Each structure stands twice: as C-alpha cells, then as structure tokens.
Amino acid sequence: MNPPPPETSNPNKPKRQTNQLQYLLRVVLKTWKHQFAWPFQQPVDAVKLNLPDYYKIIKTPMDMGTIKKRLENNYYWNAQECIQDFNTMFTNCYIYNKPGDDIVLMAEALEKLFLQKINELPTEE
Ligand SMILES: CCS(=O)(=O)c1ccc(OC)c(-c2cn(C)c(=O)c3ccc(-c4cnn(C)c4)cc23)c1
Known part of the structure; x- marks a missing residue:
C-alpha cells in the first residue's frame, strides 16, 4: 500500500555542482537538526500510520x-x-x-x- 519512494538517482541527467546547490545541502538541508524534523525526514509511511487516504490525496509526495x-x-x-x-x-x-x-x-x-x-x-x- 505505500508507493515506492521518489527517484533519487538518474545517471541519464547531467550533473554539476553550483554554489547554490552546495548551500542547499550544507546550510539549508542540514539546518535536518531541527526539533521538528523527524516527520519530514522520510516519506510518509501510510502503512505504518494506517492512513490509506494519504496517497489518494497526495500525488506528489516529497x-x-x-x-x-x-x-x-x-x-x-x-x-x-x-x-x-x-x-x-x-x-x-x-x-x-x-x-x-x-x-x-x-x-x-x-x-x-x-x-x-x-x-x-x-x-x-
Ligand atoms: C515520516 C516518518 S513516519 O511516516 O512514520 C511519520 C511519523 C510521524 C509523523 O507525524 C507526527 C508523520 C507525518 C508526516 N507528515 C508530513 C504528515 O503530513 C503527517 C500527517 C498525519 C500523520 C498522522 C499520524 N497519525 N495520524 C492519525 C495522522 C502523520 C504525518 C510521519
């Protein structure tokens, strides 16, 4: 009943590093340490939580x-x-x-x- 997680790797797309991408991982994402982060750290586990409508309503999980x-x-x-x-x-x-x-x-x-x-x-x- 959960969907597979979003794609995280695709070798067919070209790759670069940029100052803004570095900032997004090193400052923005890392600033992950917040008190409130856990419910956003992994996909919503509708099976575990028994929320069979979650993926009926949310078609672009992230x-x-x-x-x-x-x-x-x-x-x-x-x-x-x-x-x-x-x-x-x-x-x-x-x-x-x-x-x-x-x-x-x-x-x-x-x-x-x-x-x-x-x-x-x-x-x-
Ligand atoms: C992401 C790890 S988890 O899937 O086990 C998890 C744990 C705790 C969570 O909230 C306290 C959630 C969760 C995350 N997000 C982003 C939601 O929007 C969300 C909405 C509802 C619920 C929830 C839990 N139980 N019930 C009745 C509802 C739970 C969630 C998700």
Missing part, C-alpha cells in the same frame, strides 16, 4: 530524506528544482492536514526557517 539523497546524487541541475521539492513537501502537509494540527505547526516553523535561509542563497555562476 520529503527531506529524498531531497538529501537527490543533492548527494547531484539529481538537480538548478537550485530551483530543489527549492520546489521543499515547497512541495510543505504544501503536501498543508493540504492533507488542518490548521492548528501539531504537524502543521511543525511544518510552519520548518518552512519559516527554510525561507530565512533561502533569502540568503549565494550568487549564481
């Missing part, structure tokens, strides 16, 4: 484990692809859950930190 692996495997060419995956992750949480739910307050806090760090993205090549 999570920080996936993002980290993507950054490590040079999956993204453009930083904005990675930023989009973060934003997807947050939006999923907002769609599935209701305001004032603990998990939503967790996501809001994580997203505020995420946004602060993106406002300090370094210069593009």
Whole structure:
C-alpha cells in the first residue's frame, strides 16, 4: 500500500555542482537538526500510520530524506528544482492536514526557517 519512494538517482541527467546547490545541502538541508524534523525526514509511511487516504490525496509526495539523497546524487541541475521539492513537501502537509494540527505547526516553523535561509542563497555562476 505505500508507493515506492521518489527517484533519487538518474545517471541519464547531467550533473554539476553550483554554489547554490552546495548551500542547499550544507546550510539549508542540514539546518535536518531541527526539533521538528523527524516527520519530514522520510516519506510518509501510510502503512505504518494506517492512513490509506494519504496517497489518494497526495500525488506528489516529497520529503527531506529524498531531497538529501537527490543533492548527494547531484539529481538537480538548478537550485530551483530543489527549492520546489521543499515547497512541495510543505504544501503536501498543508493540504492533507488542518490548521492548528501539531504537524502543521511543525511544518510552519520548518518552512519559516527554510525561507530565512533561502533569502540568503549565494550568487549564481
Ligand atoms: C515520516 C516518518 S513516519 O511516516 O512514520 C511519520 C511519523 C510521524 C509523523 O507525524 C507526527 C508523520 C507525518 C508526516 N507528515 C508530513 C504528515 O503530513 C503527517 C500527517 C498525519 C500523520 C498522522 C499520524 N497519525 N495520524 C492519525 C495522522 C502523520 C504525518 C510521519
């Protein structure tokens, strides 16, 4: 009943490092240590949690484990692809859950930190 996780490696896509991609892995993702990170560190395990509607409602799942692996495997060419995956992750949480739910307050806090760090993205090549 869970879907396979998102793809994290694709040798058919070209690979590069950029200052912004480095910042996304080393500053943004790592800043993973937050109090509230665990529910976002791996795909939502609908089987474990007995949430058979989760993947009926969320058709673009995303999570920080996936993002980290993507950054490590040079999956993204453009930083904005990675930023989009973060934003997807947050939006999923907002769609599935209701305001004032603990998990939503967790996501809001994580997203505020995420946004602060993106406002300090370094210069593009
Ligand atoms: C990601 C590791 S996990 O799948 O075991 C896990 C553990 C705890 C979690 O929240 C406290 C979640 C979780 C993550 N996200 C992103 C959600 O949106 C989410 C929504 C609902 C629930 C949940 C747990 N039990 N129930 C009734 C609902 C649980 C979640 C997921």
